[PDB]
Amino acid sequence: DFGTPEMLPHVQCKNSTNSTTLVSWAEPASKHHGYILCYKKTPSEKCENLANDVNSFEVKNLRPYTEYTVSLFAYVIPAKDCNFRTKAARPGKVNGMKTSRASDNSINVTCNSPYEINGPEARYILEVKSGGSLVKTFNQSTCKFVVDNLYYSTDYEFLVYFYNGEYLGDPEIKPQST
Amino acid sequence: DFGTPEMLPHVQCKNSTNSTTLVSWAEPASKHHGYILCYKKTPSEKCENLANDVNSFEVKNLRPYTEYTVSLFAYVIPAKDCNFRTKAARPGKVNGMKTSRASDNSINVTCNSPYEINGPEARYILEVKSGGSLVKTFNQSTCKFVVDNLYYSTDYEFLVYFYNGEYLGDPEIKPQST
Ligand SMILES: *[C@@H]1O[C@H](CO)[C@@H](O)[C@H](O)[C@H]1NC(C)=O
Ligand SMILES: *[C@@H]1O[C@H](CO)[C@@H](O)[C@H](O)[C@H]1NC(C)=O
Ligand SMILES: *[C@@H]1O[C@H](CO)[C@@H](O)[C@H](O)[C@H]1NC(C)=O
Ligand SMILES: *[C@@H]1O[C@H](CO)[C@@H](O)[C@H](O)[C@H]1NC(C)=O
Ligand SMILES: *[C@@H]1O[C@H](CO)[C@@H](O)[C@H](O)[C@H]1NC(C)=O
Ligand SMILES: *[C@@H]1O[C@H](CO)[C@@H](O)[C@H](O)[C@H]1NC(C)=O
């Protein structure tokens, strides 16, 4: 109906930066208005000629946990797009793992996300070991752990794994004494 | 016309793996056929409510050298999609840089692509230094360099930079003697 959320014509957005753009549109004199800005990555179609007279094809080299759309075209020598999602895989290792003394018997552990997530979620698992024995374990949304109440002159190992909702990746291991 | 490249109905593609899928379609008894399989990443629209009665908006936190599409919706409190591309940025550092002796006065240098490309191309720049002086330079598509005819008992530094068609990133530096 008139005044309900409708798409706006003549929108400008080309004045971009490496990480931003300025989106601008016509100024209505008329009344008071609310707005919804919508955006997505423009994906480019990748086409290939298969072998003649084949019934199936294995599409390879796809990224894990990614939504894709396929279409087939035939020629002699309404059709809907087919949607699928690749299965999840093991994520990569965390980046920039830093182990630091917070106090006399306290250690602070920080890291940044892996580049390859490969799944629906993002969690950080920290294992704390001494002489190969599990001393403490933590599971968080943010890779900022405060590990306190440890023994005074002890060698500890800190193992941070990324969890993507389906898989645990390899740990980034860092030694740190008290 | 009849027999020219037309989109095929009833295509199946859901039996995926972490990096592949099986795409299958109806077997025509009729004649001999050629095929084009087309695919792309299905991008998800990200919508947000802006402030009321505004004329412009700065879309931030975008990836460098990425194509995007924007649309605006107004409501009281044919319109085309607007396409743009973020500008290029400095790529990241190369991964897994390995320096090895190929012979007595020969060194082999290998690395893998950075995670962040941020531009249209992919090239590897290798600088070879001795006592801070530039000895050799190479520019290649593949990060596999064979550095021969060096002096016999000399310390050299190998600096590999990634070039993305617009920017050079930071070097990965590795010492290697002959
Ligand atoms: C992808 O799946 C195969 C089959 O299970 C597995 O061997 C491979 O490790 C997987 N990749 C990752 C990164 O999980
Ligand atoms: C340890 O991290 C906490 C935040 O999680 C912070 O308040 C504290 O100052 C940090 N200590 C050191 C030594 O960085
Ligand atoms: C970490 O916690 C989440 C809940 O917040 C849970 O679903 C997940 O299973 C835990 N991590 C691992 C590695 O299982
Ligand atoms: C993005 O652009 C700004 C402005 O020139 C610059 O300071 C910043 O370093 C750029 N980022 C990269 C990774 O090139
Ligand atoms: C050096 O690399 C070349 C390929 O570029 C290969 O033929 C040669 O065997 C390599 N040598 C060593 C020591 O790996
Ligand atoms: C490397 O070579 C390409 C041509 O193949 C050239 O366009 C580019 O300028 C060179 N690299 C750098 C860092 O300029």
Q: Which of B40, B20, B36, B83 is nearest to A45 (CA)?
A: B40
Q: Would you call B88 and A50 a contact, using CB atoms and an 8 Å cutoff?
A: no
The pairing of beta strand A123-130 with beta strand A155-163: antiparallel
Q: Which residues of A touch B77 (CB under 8 A)?
A: 31-34
| Contact in structure between B43 and A40 (CB atoms under 8 Å) | yes
Cβ-proximal residues to B2 (8 Å cutoff; 6+ apart), any chain: none
Q: Which residue has the tokens 């440890």?
A: A150
Determine the longest span between alpha carbons in chain B, in angstroms: 79
| Contact in structure between A74 and B37 (CB atoms under 8 Å) | no
Choose which residue among B58, B61, B90 to substitute to test ligand 4 binding: the one with the highest number of ligand atoms within 8 A of its C-beta.
Answer: B90
State CA A17 to chain mean position distance. Answer: 22
Q: In terms of C-beta density within 10 A (0-12 exposed, 13-18 middle, 19 or more buried), how is residue B68 classed?
A: buried
**How many Å apart are CA B120 and CA B108, to the nearest integer?**
27
Q: Would you call B115 and A118 a contact, using CB atoms and an 8 Å cutoff?
A: no
State CA B133 to chain mean position distance. Answer: 32
**How many Å apart are CA B65 and CA A176, to the nearest integer?**
40
| Contact in structure between A151 and A178 (CB atoms under 8 Å) | yes
B96 in helix, strand or coil? strand
* C-alpha distance from residue A85 to each of A70, A120, B44 (Å): 11, 12, 13
